[PDB]
Amino acid sequence: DKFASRHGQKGVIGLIVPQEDMPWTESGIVPDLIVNPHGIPSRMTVGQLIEAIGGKVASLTGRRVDGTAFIGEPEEKLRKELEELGFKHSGREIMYDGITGRRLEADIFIGVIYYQRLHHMVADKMHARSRGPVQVLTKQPTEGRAREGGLRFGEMERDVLIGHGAAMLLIERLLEESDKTEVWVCESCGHLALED
Amino acid sequence: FRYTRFEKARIIGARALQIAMGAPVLIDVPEGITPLQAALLEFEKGVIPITVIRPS
Amino acid sequence: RVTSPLSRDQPHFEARDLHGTHWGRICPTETPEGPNCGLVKNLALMSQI
Amino acid sequence: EFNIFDHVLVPEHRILSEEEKEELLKKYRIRISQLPQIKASDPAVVALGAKPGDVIEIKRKSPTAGYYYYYRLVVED
Amino acid sequence: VERIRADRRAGKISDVINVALYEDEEVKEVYINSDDGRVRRPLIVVENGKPKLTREHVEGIKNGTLTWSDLIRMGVIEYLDAEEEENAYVATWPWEVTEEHTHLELMPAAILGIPASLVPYPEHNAAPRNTYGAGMAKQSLGLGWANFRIRVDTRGHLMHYPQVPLVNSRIMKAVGFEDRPAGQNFVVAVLSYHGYNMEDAVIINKASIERGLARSTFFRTYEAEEKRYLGGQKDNFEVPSPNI
Amino acid sequence: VAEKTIKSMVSKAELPDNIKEELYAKLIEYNEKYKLKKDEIQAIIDETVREYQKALIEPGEAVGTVAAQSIGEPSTQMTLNINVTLGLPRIIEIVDARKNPSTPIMTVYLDEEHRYDRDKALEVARRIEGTTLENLAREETIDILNMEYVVEIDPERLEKAGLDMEKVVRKLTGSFKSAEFEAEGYTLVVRPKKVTKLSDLRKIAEKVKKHRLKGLSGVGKTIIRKEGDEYVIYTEGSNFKQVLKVPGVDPTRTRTNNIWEIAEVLGIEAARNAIIDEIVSTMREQGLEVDVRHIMLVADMMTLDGVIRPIGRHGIVGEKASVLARAAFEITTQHLFAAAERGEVDPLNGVVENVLIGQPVPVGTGIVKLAMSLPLRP
Amino acid sequence: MKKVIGSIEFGILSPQEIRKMSAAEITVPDTYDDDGYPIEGGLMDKRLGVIDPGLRCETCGARAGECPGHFGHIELARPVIHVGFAKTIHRVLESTCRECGRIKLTDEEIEEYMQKFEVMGDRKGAVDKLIKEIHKKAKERMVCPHCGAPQFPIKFERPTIYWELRKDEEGNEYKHRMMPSEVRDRLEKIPDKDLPLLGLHPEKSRPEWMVLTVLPVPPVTMRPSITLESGIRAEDDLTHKLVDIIRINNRLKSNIEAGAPQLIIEDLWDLLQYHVTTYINNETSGVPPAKHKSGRPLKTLAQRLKGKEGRFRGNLSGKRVNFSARTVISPDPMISINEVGVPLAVAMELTVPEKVTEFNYEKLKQRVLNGPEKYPGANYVIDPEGRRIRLMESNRELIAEKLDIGWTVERHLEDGDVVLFNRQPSLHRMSIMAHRVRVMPYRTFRLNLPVCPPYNADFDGDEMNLHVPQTEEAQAEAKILMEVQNHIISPRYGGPLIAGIQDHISGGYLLTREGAYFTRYEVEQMLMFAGMDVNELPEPDKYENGEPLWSGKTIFSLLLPDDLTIWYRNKLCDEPERCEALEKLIEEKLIPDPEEVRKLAYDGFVYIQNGKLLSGAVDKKAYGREDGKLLDIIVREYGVERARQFLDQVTKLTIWVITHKGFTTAIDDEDLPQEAIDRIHEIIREAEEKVQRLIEAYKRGELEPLPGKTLEETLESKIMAVLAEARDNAGKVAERYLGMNNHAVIMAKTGARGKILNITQMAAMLGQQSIRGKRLYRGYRGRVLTHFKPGDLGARARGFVTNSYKSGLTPQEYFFHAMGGREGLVDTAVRTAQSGYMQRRLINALQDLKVDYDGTVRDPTGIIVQFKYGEDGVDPMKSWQGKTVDVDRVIVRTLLKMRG
Amino acid sequence: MIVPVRCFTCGKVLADKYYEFKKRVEAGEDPGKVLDDLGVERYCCRRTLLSHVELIDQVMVYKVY
Amino acid sequence: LGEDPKDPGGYFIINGSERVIVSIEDLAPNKTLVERDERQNKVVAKVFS
Ligand SMILES: [Mg+2]
Ligand SMILES: [Zn+2]
Ligand SMILES: [Zn+2]
Ligand SMILES: [Zn+2]
């Protein structure tokens, strides 16, 4: 299931981790989501961190944090009120591992980030066809998922199958599984013979 | 003499096709494997009867 | 939403790119991806017609 | 004057004899029409004084093998 | 040009008319535009380094005695198209106005679109990231419409517990996104967890999902028509017999 | 171990010539450092032979398809946009065998008498550089009292072209015998012999501007760079035939971006080498590493018939012997109709035709032939 | 027996052949009557085939779905010029005499051209060149060499109009329209001996057949008719075109039989010619395309054959296949690189057909007895005779009791089954690999992370396809050739492609860095997590607070083989003195003491001796993509299976390290002290002062033009260079003030994810925003935005952003960054299409090249493209960094092996 | 559209005190002190209570039957 | 009336399906625009009357 932040950070759910296995902070907060730290600096997404700090500050104080462009609440002010609230300025919190139970050697940055679920759900995107309806013209599997259609093995797939050197795999894919048929051919002239 | 990857794949495919419609296995079987696994064990034991014709 | 009569497959380097006159009229960031980038724009919040 | 074979981009060119041409045909089991072609108006051909119907043996610098031996067939324009 | 601008600011002529002057060393031209299709923006008129908008106008706007059309009528704020703005020198902030400045920007954050204003602190993000966030704001799920149950849309989505973001731009309240939210606030901790959040992936809490977080419902509408054919033949709404 | 024994072992080894000398040099270098024994050297030779045998490509590999994929895949992550127009457009221009590439650039090398001092390099660059008087001209004005161009040029530009105004006149007195050219200090004034209509004035004024005073035709910008304590001249435009025969330019290292000029001047072999070098340089500029074997195979396929051919419908695919191969890629209707006109017979020896029909392709396992002994007795 | 198509011979269909192949004659321009039955003599006649299930074909007696279809013929009232041959017809009209019919060449020239045709062989280009030369030579002769009759020039008007330039008795030159009947009569006079000179086969490509007298109407199956949801039949475009053709032909026949004047006959002939031309090709130049009653242009046979959606590309080269699935992918480090996560729903749908043998009889019987609704089960059963029965609840036990040797069971996807895993677009042969089926009860696909870089796939909603081979040969080919571990090294550059990325690199650095020690419980836990066969713990390196501690290098050493020794420098090198000392110590002894190495061990120099990591820290240079030396050596020296096991174990170990030690990034990672901010502001002020000085110098005229450049772009280049120097200085300051303890700096330096410029952009400055390689200039007159004075060329007014992401950009700088990002996005969106087109062109140019058994690459014709592939006969995949044999590595490894 | 019964993070019940919190917020008091006196101390429960907006009253008006 | 008060309107309902007319960014009618073609080496002015 596709979940996206408001700063272009998107991704599918990798694991449904039970609460007992999830880490928790010293304040007794268990995160509702865990994101990889590698994606934050590569895409130069500091607004996500500022939004996390602002969300934590808004939750702790009860007052909504303004995030308007160029007139929003300054980041340094947000860190100041986070410090005045009894938390670290950077937003990092001391977390304990949910499995081993030991304290993590690094203070983990945890905050409230607005994450929205998208309509690209895995329920409407899974397609699986073994055999079924075929087109009346080419005797090939139909189009799309609504009519139990097949999956297109395009020109590029054929090219990379040729590059792999798999002749019989290509024969099975393109011919033996899509539009295999038998015809009668006259050896004298090469015309298609007629069977009555 | 060595077997190329394409030659080995062709030999294994031919042996598996033979096993699927006859051609009893020349070695023991783990009682439940697919014919492809049977051809793989036949190749691993060095008991395959299929040779490769090479131009000369 | 605002579209353009130009073809989507055409590389329009001078047309798809953001213009300085789009300030206050065309949103500088909200554009679609792929061939629709640049040719499809959205009106700014202060845009008046 | 300026010899065309002194250029670093121009590999060495030699004229194959009839016996050498027959040996080349026998080695790869190919006919005279299955060799790569070179135009009779090519500057290397007119530098060698060749005529159509001959085979030019090219010693080229190989980035992977040091020296490589290619073969071409002189054909009319 | 000055007389036309003064008359427009005095309310004598309509605000649709826009006047511009091109003064080159070779050619000199005056352009007047009063047609359709011209995208314009509102700018506060600044004269002698002092903006026309005063605190009294803001108080009247807040009290409801003054409207936006009233402000346009007195020429305090005027609509400028691309042609007229070539002769204008706009000031980004009210504290940056000088004697040479001719206009004052109303809202620098208003240059963004409606979905682009959903992004909190867009100036702290990369431009492709802001573009992706603006594009994906339209793909989110939430209580878009209160009459979704009676609607007959072929496909629709509903969030069970939609939430207004805690870090939201003030324009979203005016736009109406706060009344119709399309997401939830997630307690996110940035941490590597067993490699299952690798390559943009995320890890969700099982108890949070079981508690109703990010729960959604998908509605699909099918239609059936009792079409009438030629000769009086028509479809029938009944359970088909097994013999057919 | 003596050097003679190592050389004899290297010669007796079943290794290529290029591997033999490199291996011998490395063994000599490592022999004094660690005092290698005879058995260690023999084991090293055996390991090298085994590695060479392992590195040999198995028969039946789809080298053309692999080369095409390995060239086109880095093009998906290249960067678009002196004036070298490198990147994906450069690769597209190279593989399409463009007769006139966009912004042609030639690399000019000088001999020992001009590659060590700046003055000789500048003078030979100005010899190569094609300077017209229109570029030297500063103001354009056509009058009526004499009804001809009175040309005034800035002297500073004349300080870079390295020639005097009067000699400039000598470049149009012989060339334009229908007009009289006069020099008045730093002003160039022309005189008409028999001119009375404005139509013929506009048919002869542009001929003076298009005339080249010195240098070679089609030459625009020209710069000089210091690489390897040597002066290298980079110019705009391709004039290989007129730049090879220059008194002061080394002709054994000069090259141009125009592969067609190299084919018509240095031969098809040098054209293939230049294609390989250009593709390698374009790949290395973008930071994407591509094996030179794929580029070499592509260039060999491009120059198979003795002339440079593109990879499109007018090139390698155009001269394909298979009708279905040509029809499947490009211009399907006219190719099929022309094949019907010629009565062409498709032997179906290719890969794409067998894909279209349903026969096994002649690559990889499709080339393996098997034999079976029937009396199997387990 | 069975036969295959050895070769295909092409030609032009003769009218006699069209008449003989036709099972019916079509004269009624209609398809169905009021009740829906076909009309006899119409296009939908049962003699040409049947589409509706109820009807039965008249010609062959078969029902719908099995009748191949039969062609028909229409006898045209007057001949019609075929458009596709039309221009070629004109060529013949310019080559043959108008009276004798022979070619316009002498007998000696004809004989010489015959010898030239025989000599050259079978190359197409030479044949076309000779044909063009012969046509050019014959077209300039106005006197027939055989008969002496005068000739006239012929003007060809597109598409099928021929004009003959004739002279009257008064000398006036006029144009006579050559009717198709006259053209066919002229073409009939050409003998068979002159046809090879014109490039026409005497027995297959007679020129008179190039003018259509009988039109072959296609079978019903090839142009099927369907019934819409409203009960109205929807006819095909070809059917409408044929209806129009039949109506016009019938009108022409009626007018001819009625003795209509010549104005009628030529007008109807032109209408029929236009209809036939549109039917052959509706996109012909010079004519209006045929349109439906709704205004939609029709696509005829030419558009059916050509184009991306045409038969050749959309149905023949590439087509939809059966037994395939497609869904979203999610990460799964717990599975091997050889395994793919297949959902239970997908597994119970896709079926592998397994023949019942003497060893798998019980398993397949259990699969049949389970049924389609129980896993592991079966869906279909095929008897030896060949009838397929679907397994329901009623016959599930009956079929199981009837199972015997020779039967085929379409069982559900089981563990260990080989399937194809492909992601689109497939730019390279590594974009699809054969994995092993792993069945998990969730909905999404699961793919191991090191296999992602081969697929170029992240997990931000990526969709991937899976293909299940059916035949045993296809399964064997997938298992042997396209297996994942067999394609670790990329043949494009001869380097590792299946490699650790991101968290793998970060965990390797965290484990192998100096001062990294782990407790006994942690070591046992990571050993169990990585699946290593370490029965007993090694000797602890040191004791802290009474408990044993193990160095991370010791734990990493267990992954490497015991006979492995390699040293190199990684990307973490910033003190070359220690690396030089380590290199010198290795150079002298060639077997340095492990205590001696550990005394001067440096994280910037990786050194593994006998499988023990004595020095160095793991980064992208260890087992990263395109950079991992250790993985490259392991693949080449220890096989692919050992390499796959090492990759799996090291990825699991690094994931365990990065999971429990704690890896995170926060807002303080980009934080800088006041001194760094002051230095950045000083650099900003210096850069703006330099830009202003350059602008003033350009305005006052003392700026010097660059050689070959005028003032404008010279000043622009100088300003851009100054801004680039300022950006480099700011980045250097940011790197100086950011230590290695920063996790973002760790990721940037180790090559896991991101770059140093990314951290610089979030901390120091955004640099200068440039469009198309130059400064931003598009906007108003003399300025980009109206917030700057006109004619201002300053840094702030041209796209130089002074602040970073952390400090926030000004609205003008935000707009400039938006222009830069839009330019980048447009650049990628434009580059992708051109790159794909170039890839397709290269593939179609080099599809048929193959290395033969003698090491030569030859085309299907037989021409030797290369006498040795790559001039040395070495696979680039097996090449060592583009070289034939790495003599240094071989010598060093052999020397170490003999010394140890 | 309706207040969740339990907090999404720890399952603490918050629907009981939400309407009192909303009533006190509309009275002009600081929502932080209102959350403090209602026992809502962890900011995850504060997130759930503050970010929720009531919308069921606008859905009940559209009858479906 | 079964309508959302927050619905902005501005669209059409054709056959029960909501249809929105995306604005079109066209050239100014009856206005002459001048440009130079580098490849053709000519000055071209166009007006869409
Ligand atoms: Mg993706
Ligand atoms: Zn039939
Ligand atoms: Zn004649
Ligand atoms: Zn809570």
Q: Which residue has the tokens 């004619």?
A: G791
**Residues with Cβ < 8 Å from G382, sequence gap 6 or more?**
G353, G388, G389, G407, G408, G409, G410
Report the C-alpha gap between G667 and A41 in whole angstroms. Answer: 10
Interface test with F, best of B10, B41, B54 (most F CBs within 10 A): B10
Helices and strands, number each (H, E), in chain H = 4, 0
Name the minimum distance, in Å, from the CA of E228 to any CA of chain C.
40
CB atoms within 10 A of CB G835: 23
- Least CA distance to E134: which residue of chain C? C30
Domains of chain H: 1-65 (1.10.10.60)
CA angle A56–A60–A62, rounded 5-degree value: 110
**Residues with Cβ < 8 Å from A74, sequence gap 6 or more?**
none
What are the distances in angstroms from CA G287 to CA G179, G271, G279, G302, G837? 18, 12, 12, 15, 30
CB contact under 8 A, G350 and A92: no
Residue type, H49: L
CB G387 within 8 A of CB G414: no
Chain F, window 305-324: residues with a beta carbon less than 8 angstroms from a chain D beta carbon: 305-307
Report the C-alpha gap between G710 and G691 in whole angstroms. Answer: 18
Helix residue ranges, H only, chain F: 3-12, 17-34, 38-55, 63-75, 88-95, 118-128, 133-136, 155-161, 165-173, 198-202, 205-210, 240-244, 259-265, 268-285, 292-302, 323-329, 332-342, 352-357
Distance G51 CA to ligand 2 centre (A): 10
Q: Which residues of chain B make contact with A168, given a CB cutoff of 8 A? A: 10, 13
Task: Give the CATH architecture of domain G663-810.
Answer: Orthogonal Bundle (1.10)
What are the distances in angstroms from CA G254 to CA G77, G217, G249, G551? 9, 21, 9, 101
Active-site annotation holds for E81 = no
Residue type, F315: G
Name the minimum distance, in Å, from the CA of A164 to any CA of chain B.
10
Report the C-alpha gap between G371 and F174 in whole angstroms. Answer: 100
Q: Which residues of chain A make contact with F360, given a CB cutoff of 8 A? A: 167-168, 171
Name the minimum distance, in Å, from the CA of B45 to any CA of chain G.
16
CB contact under 8 A, E166 and H44: no
CB G183 within 8 A of CB G82: no
Helix (H, G, I), strand (E, B) or coil at A127: strand
From the CA of G49, the nearest ligand is 2
Q: Which chains touch F (3 or more CB pairs under 8 A)?
A: A, B, D, G
The three-state DSSP-derived secondary structure of G674-693 is HHHHHHHHHHHHHHHHHHHH
D in contact with G (at least 3 C-beta pairs within 8 A): yes
Distance G457 CA to ligand 1 centre (A): 6
Interface test with C, best of E43, E85, E106, E112 (most C CBs within 10 A): E112
Distance E214 CA to ligand 1 centre (A): 22
Using alpha carbons, select from F364, F65, F339 the residue that is nearest to residue G845. F65
- Least CA distance to E38: which residue of chain I? I28
Task: Give the CATH architecture of domain G351-412.
Answer: 2-Layer Sandwich (3.30)
I in contact with F (at least 3 C-beta pairs within 8 A): no
Name the minimum distance, in Å, from the CA of G340 to any CA of chain F.
24
Q: Which two tokens stand for residue G441?
A: 């009860």
Domains of chain D: 1-76 (3.90.940.20)
**Residues with Cβ < 8 Å from G52, sequence gap 6 or more?**
G64
CB contact under 8 A, H43 and A59: yes
User: Which candidate from G51, G349, G663 shows the least CB-CB separation from A128?
Assistant: G349
Q: Which residues of chain E make contact with H9, given a CB cutoff of 8 A? A: 187, 205, 208
Residues of G with CB under 8 A from a CB of D: 121-123, 854, 856, 858, 861-865, 867-868, 870-872, 874, 879, 882-884
Using alpha carbons, select from G535, E138, E10 the residue that is nearest to residue C32. E138
CB contact under 8 A, C47 and E107: no
Provide CATH code, domain G324-350+413-487: 2.40.40.20
Q: Does domain G488-662+875-893 have CATH number 2.102.10.10?
A: no
Specify the pairing of strand F369-371 against strand B51-53.
antiparallel
From the CA of G102, the nearest ligand is 3
Q: Which residues of chain E make contact with A72, given a CB cutoff of 8 A? A: 120-121, 169
Report the C-alpha gap between G833 and G822 in whole angstroms. Answer: 17
User: Which candidate from A4, A6, A36 shows the least CB-CB separation from E197?
Assistant: A36
Q: Which two tokens stand for residue G403?
A: 């199972």
Residue type, G434: A
CB contact under 8 A, B52 and F60: no
Binding site for Zn(2+): what residues of A are annotated? 186, 189
Residues of B with CB under 8 A from a CB of F: 4-7, 9-11, 13-14, 23-26, 49-54
Report the C-alpha gap between A45 and G805 in whole angstroms. Answer: 8
Q: Does E38 touch chain C (CB under 8 A)?
A: yes
Q: Does D31 touch chain G (CB under 8 A)?
A: yes
**Residues with Cβ < 8 Å from G189, sequence gap 6 or more?**
G96, G100, G101
Helix residue ranges, H only, G672-810: 674-700, 711-736, 743-750, 756-763
CB atoms within 10 A of CB G864: 21
CB contact under 8 A, E183 and A116: yes
Q: Which residues of chain B make contact with G475, given a CB cutoff of 8 A? A: 13, 16, 36
Residue type, A111: G
Q: Which chains touch A (3 or more CB pairs under 8 A)?
A: B, E, F, G, H
CB contact under 8 A, C37 and G786: no
Domains of chain F: 6-322 (no CATH), 323-368 (1.10.150.390)
Q: What are the φ and ψ backbone dihedral angles of F285, each rounded to 5 degrees?
A: -65, -40
- Least CA distance to F245: which residue of chain D? D2
Range of the domain at E93: 36-113
Q: Where are the domains of chain G?
A: 3-323, 324-350+413-487, 351-412, 488-662+875-893, 663-810
Our measurement of the distance from residue G532's CA atom to the centroid of its chain's CA atoms, rounded to an integer in Å, reads 39
Size (chain E), residues: 244
**Residues with Cβ < 8 Å from G96, sequence gap 6 or more?**
G102, G103, G104, G138, G186, G187, G189, G190, G194, G198
Distance G52 CA to ligand 2 centre (A): 12
Distance G71 CA to ligand 2 centre (A): 10
Name the minimum distance, in Å, from the CA of G758 to any CA of chain E.
10
Tell me the technique behind this structure.
cryo-EM
Using alpha carbons, select from F322, F378, F310 the residue that is nearest to residue F350. F322
Distance H11 CA to ligand 4 centre (A): 6
Distance F294 CA to ligand 4 centre (A): 60
Specify the pairing of strand G324-331 against strand G445-447.
parallel
CB contact under 8 A, E199 and G808: no
CB contact under 8 A, F71 and G853: no
Q: Which residue has the tokens 């330099």?
A: G690
Our measurement of the distance from residue G437's CA atom to the centroid of its chain's CA atoms, rounded to an integer in Å, reads 25
Identify the bridge partners of residue A65 per DSSP, sorted by sequence position. Answer: E167
Report the C-alpha gap between A59 and F108 in whole angstroms. Answer: 70
From the CA of G46, the nearest ligand is 2
- Least CA distance to I25: which residue of chain E? E37
Our measurement of the distance from residue G773's CA atom to the centroid of its chain's CA atoms, rounded to an integer in Å, reads 29
Residue E218, H or E segment: strand E216-220
Q: Which two tokens stand for residue H54?
A: 């009531």
Q: Is G100 annotated as a binding residue?
A: yes
Using alpha carbons, select from G203, G100, G199 the residue that is nearest to residue G147. G100
Helix residue ranges, H only, F129-267: 133-136, 155-161, 165-173, 198-202, 205-210, 240-244, 259-265
User: Which candidate from F59, F371, F376 shows the least CB-CB separation from B53?
Assistant: F371
Rounded to the nearest 5 percent, the helix, strand and coil shares of chain G are: 40, 15, 40
- Least CA distance to G666: which residue of chain A? A109
Identify the bridge partners of residue F192 per DSSP, sorted by sequence position. Answer: F179
Identify the bridge partners of residue I47 per DSSP, sorted by sequence position. Answer: I32
Is the backbone peptide bond immediately before F59 cis, with ω within 30 degrees of 0?
Answer: no
Residue type, H3: V
CB contact under 8 A, F69 and A175: no
Looking at beta carbons, which pairs linking G719-724 to residues 24 or more positions away fall under 8 Å? Answer: G719/G691, G719/G694, G719/G695, G719/G775, G719/G793, G719/G795, G719/G798, G720/G768, G720/G770, G720/G774, G720/G775, G722/G687, G722/G690, G722/G691, G722/G694, G723/G687, G723/G691, G723/G767, G723/G768, G723/G795, G723/G800, G724/G767, G724/G768
